[PDB]
C-alpha cells in the first residue's frame, strides 16, 4: 500500500504543523485508517511524535481524532503509546520539549502512559524533570500517583 | 531556531553515543548558513578527546545521520553539573513545586525519584514551617523523606554543648559520644 | 564521715562484686550507731535483685569483709548515668579543664581517653572561638578531635536550602544528596 | 516507707521554700526511729548554705510543719539534672511513649509541652523510620516538631563535601556558604 | 581564538556595564567571519531584556568600543551559578589547593577570603583526617575556619538519641533541648 | 456543725485506707452530705486528696459514690476538682504518686480536670511527667487533646 | 621478724594520721628499713596507701623520707609504685579521693607512675576523672603527655 | 615627543608578541627611557599589560629589563604596578588569563603588588580565583600571607 517516501511526506507535514495539507491528504488521497501506520525511515517515530515535539496542539488533536475515529480502541491505545527505535513515546518528546498543552491532551483525553520506559530506562516523568520543564513535571505529580522505586 | 523534533533526536543520538562521557543535554542555536550544537557533559575531556578526535568523528557522524552538508554544523562543549545530583537544582525544583500547589509529600517524592534515577546513593528532602494547625503560634513542623541516609548507630549519639568565658574570648564546647550498642544489648 | 581508705576499699570490693551490674561508684554517710552506704549503678534491678536477694547477700558479705557487727550497716541503691558516656558531664568537664589553664588539645585528649576507656564506640570534642590570632576580628576557629565518627561516604554529601514564601506562611526547604562513589571512581 | 500524702506535702513545702535553689524533687526512706529525707536540686550550694545554715533551718521548720519531734528526721542533699532540660531523659521518655501505643505526634507534643513548661528556650523532637506505607522498601520518613529552633537565615545555606587522596592519608573537606538574603531580595 | 587582552577588556567593559545584572564572566569563540561572545550572569532576564533590548544595545555599544564592523559579532547569554557562592566549586577548589601542597590553614583562608569578597553572609571550611601525629591510629582531627556562622545560643544545646524496637519496624528518636541562658546567668 | 478535730479524724481514716470505719462514720455518726466539707487544718486538702495520693482505690470510689449520691451535680464537680491552699487537686497528688487506677477512676467516671493549674503553674499533666510516672502520663496524652502552649 | 598484728598497728596509725607514734615506732621499736614491708592482712596495701587515701600530707612525706633514707633507690621505686591485691597504687587511692597535695608529692618529688593499670584495667588518670576529682585530673594532663590509646 | 599613533603601534606589537620589532624600535627609533610612557588610547593600559595578558614571557621580560635599565628604581616600581582607567595592573590581567610564568616573573623578580584593588574592589588574588585559574591562585597563597578581611 503506502510507500516510505509518502509516509515521510505525511510526517514532515505533521512536523511543520501544516494541518491544512494533512486534512487534505486524509480526506482524498490516503485512507485515514492508514495514518496510524506512517513511520519515519530511520527512527520509526510516528506523526504524533513530530507534532507533539513541536507543540502543534491543533495538528496533534486532529491526528488523535482521526486515528480514534478510523481505528479500533485497541489500535488507538497502541498508537498513542507507540515507541520509536529508541523506545520513546510522543509523550517523551513532548515532555523533553516542555509542551504542556500537548501533554494534557495526551494524558487527560487520550490516556497516554507516562510510565513507559525507553532503551535508557527513562519515562516521561524523568524526561520532563531532566530538561527543567517544571510545568510539565508538576502536572505529572498531581495527575498520577508518582513515588520512588527499587 | 531548532525545532523540538531536532532536540529530541539529538538527545536520542547523544545519550547512546556518549554513554559513559556523562552526557547531560544539548543547547542549539541557528545562524546565517551555520548551525551550532553545544554539547553539555560532566567531563569534557572524553568528549573533546585527543585533539578533537572524538569531536570531529561525531561532527561527521552527525552529518551522516541528520543529512547536513559538510561545513553547515559544528560541535561545541560545555561542562555542567549533573542536574539530578545537584542539591542546589533540586532545592530550587522543590521551591517551584511548592509554589505551584503541589502537596509537600508529592513534591518530595518527585525529587527523590528523580535523584535516585539519576544514580545517587542517597537523597533527603525536608520541608519545615507551620505545615499543620496548632494552638501555639510558635509551634513548627518538619516532614522528612529519605532513601539510604544514616546508620542505626547514629541513634546511639548524645551531644552536649557548653559556653565558657575565658580571657582570650568566649569559647564554645561541643561533645559527642556514640554509645556502644554491643554493651546494652539485652542478655 | 567515712575516710578515704573506706571509699577506696569499698570501690575495690564493688567493682569486682558488681562487674556486669554496671557499677558506677558509692556515696557513704555515717550517723548515730548506723552507717549508710548508697550504691550507684546504671541498672538497679540486678542490684536489688529478687526481693533484695542480691542486696541482703551483699550486706552480709560486706560485714564479713569489713568486720561490721550485724545491724550497723545497710545498703541503698540509686540509678545514675555513667559518667564516661554522659555528654553533659564531659562537656562540663571540658569547661573545667579550659578554665584551669589546660591547652585545648590536652583537654580534648583527656576527655576522649576517658570516654573510650569508659567503653564508648566513639567520641568527638570540638572547641570553637578566637583560638588563634587573625587580622579579621570576625574570623573564628574550631579544633575537632574524634575517634570512630562517620563514614568515608559522608564526604560525598552536598546540601542546599531554599526559603519559600507561601500563603500559609514561610516554608524552609532542605535537600541532601549523597553521590555514589562507585560512579566517580577512576577507570 | 513514707506514704503518697507525705511525698505530696513535702513537694508542696519545698517547691515554695526552695523556689530559686532549683528544686527538683525528693526521695524519702524510713528506718528504726529515724526518718531520712533526701532533697534533690540543681545546685546544692544554696541548699546546704553556709555550714548547713539553710539545712538546719529547714530541718527545724519541717519539724514545726509536720510535727516531728527533734532528732527524728534529718535532711540530705543530692545534685541531679533537671528532668525537663535533660535530652537524655526526654528521649527515654519518648521511647516509653512510643512503646505504649501513643501516636508519634501526641508523644512529641507531650515532651515538647513538658520541656517548655520546664523553662527551656527551645525544644525539638524527631522520629524516623518506616512511619507510613511506601512502595519502595528503602523509603524512610521523619516527622519533626519544634519550638524556637533556628533562624530564617539557615535557609540560605548550601554545603558541599569532597574526599581527597593525599600521601599522609585521606582527607575530608566540607564547605558551608551562607548566602546574603539582602543580595537576592526582589527590587 | 580570542587573546588574553580581549578577555581582559571584555571583562572590564561588562563588569561596569552589567553591575546589578549579576555578571559572572565571559566565554568567547572565533569562527569564519563571525565572532561569538557568550555572556554569563546569574539572571539572564535583565541581560536579554525586553525582546533583546538590552542585548542589541550592548552589541552595538560593543562595536563602538572595540571597533567591530556591524554583523561581525553577536552576543549570547547563559545562566551560571556564582562561583564564590557555590559550595560545590569551593570544595573542589579546596581539593585543588590541598593536592598542590598548600597548607590547610592557607587553603581555608583563600577560600574564605574569596567567598566573603563574593558577597556571602558567612563561610565555613573544615578539613578532617589524620592531620597531625597521634599514638592511636584511629585518632582523627578537624580544623575549622568560619566567618559569621551560628549564635551564642547554640552552645546551650544538648541532644540525645534513642533506638526503639516497634512492630512496624525500628524507629529512631532524636531530642534537642536548647536551655535558656537567662535562667543560668549568675545572680 | 462538724468541728476541726473530727474533720481530721475522718481524713486521717481516708489516708490510712480504713474504708470500714468510713462507712461506719457516714451511715451512723455524720451525714454523708457533709463528707464533701471535711478539710485538713493546715492544707485545706480533702479526704479525696488523702485516699488518692495513697492509691486506695476502694476508699476513693466510696468517697466519690457517697458524695455523688448525697450532693447536687454542681457540688460533686466542685468537690472532685477541689484545690488545697497550694492549689492542688486530688488528681495532682495521684499523678505525682503515679497511682494509675485512681487516675482512671477520677477522669473516666467522674470527669476530673487534669488542666487545673496550681500556685506554681503546674497541672496534673506536668506533675505526672515531672515525677517520672510514665504510665499516668501516657494515659493523659491518649485521653485528652494535649498540646504545648504560650 | 615483724608479725602481722604489728604490721596492722603500724598501718592503722598511718591511716589515722598519728605521725607522732609513727616516728616513735621507727626511732625505737622497729627498724625504718622494715617500714616498706608492712602490708595489711586482707588487701596487701601499704602504709603509703592508707596515709595517701586520707590526705595526711605530713604523714605521707614522712613515710617517703624514711623509706628513701633507709632503703636502696630500687627499693624506693618498688615501694611508691607498690600495688595491693586489687592492683592499686597509693596514687590510685589518692586520685580516687581527690587528694591533690599527696598527688603532687608522689609525682613531683618521688616520681610515681600514674600509668600503672589495676586488675580492672584502670590507671590513676582514669580514677581521678571517674570520681569527678577535676583538680587532680587537670594536674595529670599538664604534668604528663596523656593521649587516648588502642 | 612621542605621539598617540606611535604609542599604539608599540603596544600592538607587545600584544602580538613581536619581540623582534620591539628591540628594533628601542635600539634605533625611540629612547628606551620612553617605553614606560606608552599607553593605549582608550584604556591607559601599558605594553606590560598587553604582553602579560597574552602570556608572552620573553616579550614581558624584555619590557621589564629595558624599563629597569633605562629608568630610576622609583619609576620602575610605578610602572610594574601601573593601573589603567579601570584600575587594573598587568598582574590583574595575567591572573585573569591564568598566565603563570608571567605572574612568577612579575612577583618574584620585579616585586609586583597583587593587593592593588581596582575600581570594582578586586585584587589579583581575587581575579585569579574568580576565573578558575587555580595554578596562579595557589602560587599567590604560598608566596604571600593572604587572609580574609573586614
Curated annotation (Swiss-Prot), chains A, F, G, H:
Keywords: ANK repeat, Phosphoprotein, Repeat
Modified residues (Phosphoserine): 72
Ranges annotated as spanning the membrane: none
GO cellular component: cytoplasm; MBF transcription complex; nucleus; SBF transcription complex
GO biological process assignments: cellular response to oxidative stress; positive regulation of transcription by RNA polymerase II; regulation of protein localization; response to osmotic stress; ribosomal small subunit biogenesis; ribosomal small subunit export from nucleus
Domain of life from the UniProt record: Eukaryota
Entry's Gene Ontology molecular function annotations: DNA-binding transcription activator activity, RNA polymerase II-specific; unfolded protein binding
ANK repeats: 43-72, 86-115
Task performed by this protein: Required for normal rate of cell proliferation.
Note: Present with 13100 molecules/cell in log phase SD medium.
Name this polypeptide is given: Ankyrin repeat-containing protein YAR1
Gene for this chain: YAR1
Interval of the full protein contained in this chain: 7 to 156 of 200
Curated annotation (Swiss-Prot), chains B, C, D, E:
Source organism superkingdom: Eukaryota
Modified sites of kind Phosphoserine: 86, 118
Statement: the UniProt record of this protein carries the keyword rRNA processing: no
Recorded GO MF terms: DNA-(apurinic or apyrimidinic site) endonuclease activity; RNA binding; structural constituent of ribosome
Residues found modified as Omega-N-methylarginine: 135
Gene Ontology biological process: cytoplasmic translation; maintenance of translational fidelity; nonfunctional rRNA decay; ribosomal small subunit export from nucleus; ribosomal subunit export from nucleus
Keywords: Cytoplasm, Isopeptide bond, Methylation, Phosphoprotein, Ribonucleoprotein, Ribosomal protein, RNA-binding, Ubl conjugation
Residues recorded with modification Phosphothreonine: 33, 59
Location of the KH type-2 domain: 10-81
Gene Ontology CC annotations of this record: 90S preribosome; cytoplasm; cytosol; cytosolic small ribosomal subunit; nucleus; preribosome, small subunit precursor
Main location: cytoplasm
Additional free-text comment from the UniProt record: Present with 146000 molecules/cell in log phase SD medium.
Function: Component of the ribosome, a large ribonucleoprotein complex responsible for the synthesis of proteins in the cell. The small ribosomal subunit (SSU) binds messenger RNAs (mRNAs) and translates the encoded message by selecting cognate aminoacyl-transfer RNA (tRNA) molecules. The large subunit (LSU) contains the ribosomal catalytic site termed the peptidyl transferase center (PTC), which catalyzes the formation of peptide bonds, thereby polymerizing the amino acids delivered by tRNAs into a polypeptide chain.
Quaternary structure and interacting proteins, as annotated: Component of the small ribosomal subunit (SSU). Mature yeast ribosomes consist of a small (40S) and a large (60S) subunit. The 40S small subunit contains 1 molecule of ribosomal RNA (18S rRNA) and 33 different proteins (encoded by 57 genes). The large 60S subunit contains 3 rRNA molecules (25S, 5.8S and 5S rRNA) and 46 different proteins (encoded by 81 genes).
Family to which this protein belongs: Belongs to the universal ribosomal protein uS3 family.
Protein name: Small ribosomal subunit protein uS3
Amino acid at each position: 500500500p503506502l510507500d516510505q517516501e509518502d509516509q515521510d511526506t505525511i510526517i514532515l507535514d505533521a512536523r511543520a504543523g501544516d494541518l491544512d495539507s494533512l486534512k487534505d491528504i486524509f480526506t482524498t488521497l490516503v485512507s485515514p485508517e492508514l495514518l496510524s501506520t506512517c513511520k519515519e525511515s530511520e527512527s520509526d517515530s510516528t506523526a504524533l511524535h513530530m507534532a507533539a515535539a513541536n507543540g502543534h496542539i491543533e495538528t496533534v488533536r486532529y491526528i488523535l481524532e482521526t486515528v480514534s475515529r478510523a481505528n479500533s480502541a485497541e489500535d488507538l491505545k497502541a498508537f498513542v503509546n507507540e515507541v520509536n527505535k529508541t523506545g520513546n513515546t510522543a509523550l517523551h518528546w513532548a515532555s523533553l520539549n516542555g509542551k504542556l498543552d500537548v501533554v494534557k491532551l495526551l494524558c487527560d483525553e487520550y490516556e497516554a502512559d507516562p510510565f513507559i520506559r525507553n532503551k535508557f530506562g527513562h519515562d516521561a516523568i524523568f524526561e520532563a524533570e531532566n530538561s527543567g520543564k517544571e510545568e510539565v513535571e508538576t502536572y505529572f505529580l498531581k495527575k498520577y500517583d508518582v513515588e520512588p522505586e527499587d | 531556531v531548532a525545532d523540538g523534533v531536532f532536540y529530541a533526536e539529538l538527545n536520542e543520538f547523544f545519550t547512546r553515543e556518549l554513554a559513559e562521557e556523562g552526557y547531560s543535554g544539548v543547547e542549539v542555536r541557528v545562524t546565517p548558513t551555520k548551525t551550532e550544537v553545544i554539547i553539555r557533559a560532566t567531563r569534557t575531556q572524553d568528549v573533546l578527546g585527543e585533539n578533537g578526535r572524538r569531536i570531529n568523528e561525531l561532527t561527521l557522524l552527525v552529518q551522516k545521520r541528520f543529512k547536513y552538508a559538510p561545513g553547515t554544523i559544528v560541535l561545541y562543549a560545555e561542562r555542567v553539573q549533573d542536574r539530578g545530583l545537584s542539591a542546589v537544582a533540586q532545592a530550587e525544583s522543590m521551591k517551584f513545586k511548592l509554589l505551584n500547589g503541589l502537596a509537600i509529600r508529592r513534591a518530595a517524592y518527585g525529587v527523590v525519584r528523580y535523584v535516585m534515577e539519576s544514580g545517587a546513593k542517597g537523597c533527603e528532602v525536608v520541608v519545615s514551617g507551620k505545615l499543620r494547625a496548632a494552638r501555639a503560634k510558635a509551634m513548627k513542623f518538619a516532614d522528612g523523606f529519605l532513601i539510604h541516609s544514616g546508620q542505626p548507630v547514629n541513634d546511639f549519639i548524645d551531644t552536649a554543648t557548653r559556653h565558657v568565658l575565658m580571657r582570650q574570648g568566649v569559647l564554645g564546647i561541643k561533645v559527642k559520644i556514640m554509645r556502644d550498642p554491643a554493651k546494652s544489648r539485652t542478655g
